[PDB]
């Protein structure tokens, strides 16, 4: 049993072909750890246009990062096909876990599987970011200046048989599931061009599930860290140009 690492540096990317495009996949590897390769919806951009290169994607990373590269999550303006198809948009995201392309196109909330094997007992998430929302807001067939907002939230929770991953329906959800054990939900949401801390709380308080010591050990609890440039991107409410910037990411468990 080896753990994933807990600090998120978004320096390494990895550049993956599909549908005659090419976009990164980040991921994360630190001696005496497990290499965490993240996921995004970067492939289900990818069936939306050909000729994309990896800066073009609503998922990639930045060279002006508060220490190094950062991530850069921009939800982007999909391609003639994304459009009649209902996916007019594409939220900038990131999270652990995968991304099912089967369910890019029917179910989008289905496709953005949720969860990795945790062995700690999580207690915070802290990062750094900055966020400039989009100047025209999707929503519907319309194009107006409601704000855009992002989100940024972890999940830790309790595998069953019939229960290995969790998906996106989770934040429609008030976060609530049969299965959760703790959420870290971000609530100041600002815009801002300067590195700006965040420090979420894990609530495991809400939720009043009991921890088992041995299951946890044994490999049978998930944790996962979404993030996205768009909260409701998700079902296509969102400003193509809405960039979050997400450095120095950190998993402080107990
Ligand atoms: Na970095």
Same mark, same amino acid.
């Given at each position: 049993? #080896?753990? @994933? ?9 990895? $550049? ?9 996949? %980040? ?33 990639? @990373? ?8 950062? %991530?850069?999550? @921009? ?20 999270? @652990? ?13 289905? +496709?953005? =599987? ?13 990062? !750094? !970011? #900055?966020?400039? +929302? ?24 309790? =595998? ?10 989770? +934040?429609?959800?008030? !976060? ?15 815009? $801002? ?33 979404? %993030? ?10 969102? +400003? ?8 120095? %990411?950190?998993?402080?468990? #107990?």
């Amino acid at each position: 049993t #080896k753990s @994933i690492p807990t600090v998120f540096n978004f320096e390494n990317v990895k $550049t993956v072909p599909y549908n005659k495009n090419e976009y990164y996949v %980040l991921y994360e590897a630190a001696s005496g750890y497990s290499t965490l390769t993240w996921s995004s919806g970067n492939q289900g951009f990818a069936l939306t246009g050909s000729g994309y290169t990896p800066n073009d994607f609503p998922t990639s @990373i930045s060279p002006n990062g508060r220490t190094g590269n950062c %991530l850069q999550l @921009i939800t982007r303006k999909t391609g003639s096909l994304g459009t009649l198809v209902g996916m007019p948009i594409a939220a900038g995201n990131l999270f @652990i876990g995968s991304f099912d392309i089967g369910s890019a196109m029917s179910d989008a909330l289905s +496709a953005t =599987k949720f969860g990795t094997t945790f062995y700690y007992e999580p207690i915070k998430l802290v990062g !750094y !970011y #900055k966020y400039k +929302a989009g100047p025209e807001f999707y929503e519907n067939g319309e194009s107006t200046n409601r704000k855009d907002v992002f989100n940024i939230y972890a999940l830790f929770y309790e =595998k069953t048989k019939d229960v290995q991953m969790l998906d996106g329906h989770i +934040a429609k959800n008030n !976060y609530e599931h049969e299965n959760m054990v703790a959420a870290a939900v971000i609530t100041d949401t600002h815009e $801002t061009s300067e590195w700006t801390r965040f420090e979420l709380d894990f609530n495991y308080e809400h939720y009043g599930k009991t921890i088992d010591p041995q299951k946890l050990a044994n490999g049978g609890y998930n944790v996962s860290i979404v %993030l996205s440039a768009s909260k409701d991107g998700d079902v296509f409410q969102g +400003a193509p140009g809405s960039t979050l910037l997400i450095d120095d %990411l950190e998993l402080v468990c #107990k």
